[PDB]
Amino acid sequence: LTADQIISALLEAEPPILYSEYDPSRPFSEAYMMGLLTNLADRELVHMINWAKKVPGFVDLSRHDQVHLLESAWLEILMIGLVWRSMDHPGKLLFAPDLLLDREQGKSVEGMVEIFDMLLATSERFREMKLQREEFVCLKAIILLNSGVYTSSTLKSLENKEKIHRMLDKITDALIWYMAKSGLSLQQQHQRLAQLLLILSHIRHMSNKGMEHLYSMKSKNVVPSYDLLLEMLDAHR
């Protein structure tokens, strides 16, 4: 696929924006807020699997590798979507069209304000850089494919590792091509590519801190089970 075909496929695969089912009449307790966020994330996961299967090349990886990438990336992907939705809302996190939250609301849950501040800082960075939808979808696909923890290896794992490397190179090419099509100088192209890929290190950090936080709130039932992900991947929706 040429660079435009990759971007076109990713744009067409964008998931829908879901609502939190927020009810203004309910007391807005910590448990109520976290319950809304939990059910929202759970409903977003199904759409994330559908999106992943449309990432060029993803379904040509082994089903094991598909699951493993989703297991590693799912919170990063939720977070970058949040940051994108919040770009045009300084100081706010737009979890859903009916759930806009600020720092002060995060303070009510121990450990949440620190992560809110990191998410807000990323949204500010995206706003300042005027991140384009074409760049966002490339970054989200890179997150999915780069998520696997470094690792005992078999011919199958090496085969999929090389495929993932080739896919990442093509998305890099597409990100650069979009910038060139948009008129950026060669010097601006490498600087902006570097700045955008460096933000992915911050999103990784936020995901790690977020996982720590979820485990301190819920003992178990925090990560999607392997069987759950495989079930959703195999569905012929």
Place this chain on the structure above:
Amino acid sequence: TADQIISALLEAEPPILYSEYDPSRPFSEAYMMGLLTNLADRELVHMINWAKKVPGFVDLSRHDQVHLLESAWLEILMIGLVWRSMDHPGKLLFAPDLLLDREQGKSVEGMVEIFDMLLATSERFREMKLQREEFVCLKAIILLNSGVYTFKSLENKEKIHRMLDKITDALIWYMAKSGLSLQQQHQRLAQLLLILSHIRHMSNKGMEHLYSMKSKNVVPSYDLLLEMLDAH
């Protein structure tokens, strides 16, 4: 210029320290962790000297310098370890007198996971034939980027961004001087910056492993780093 950035970073490389490993002592976990702790402690002093040689870093306020060092110090130690280890497949070269394999990492509770990640990162660097010029650029990028999204202030942030961009320019310049095509330049740049996200992951998991370990002086406290910045 780009050549001046690369030459400056090469000249700023810290010395390779020894662990003081004594083969005659019983290699208890306490003895090993002690060697690694004191080694890291001694490396930190040289990391401060090096940081002040990263172009632009001296022009930042003490508060900003401390914040960046606070966020980056373990990643910087780890990328150094990975670099020293890429001539030793299957081993981590903490120091020339302390070369450890995966088995020796099992002695520490919860360390084999981090060990394997570091080993795999060293293999990645070996496969890519990472050059010293690229390595020093990556270390400088880690220093200027790890803490920039956790911070007048708006101008200070943009100032650090410009400092980063000058290192990116130098890293691409080196690749262009080495003969890579434009496509290979952008591909290799992306490959290296994506490895940095994994080194960030390793640092985060190492931090969780150090705090949970109850280790003494897990992090260089703010006041500690603040005082070391005034040594020179």
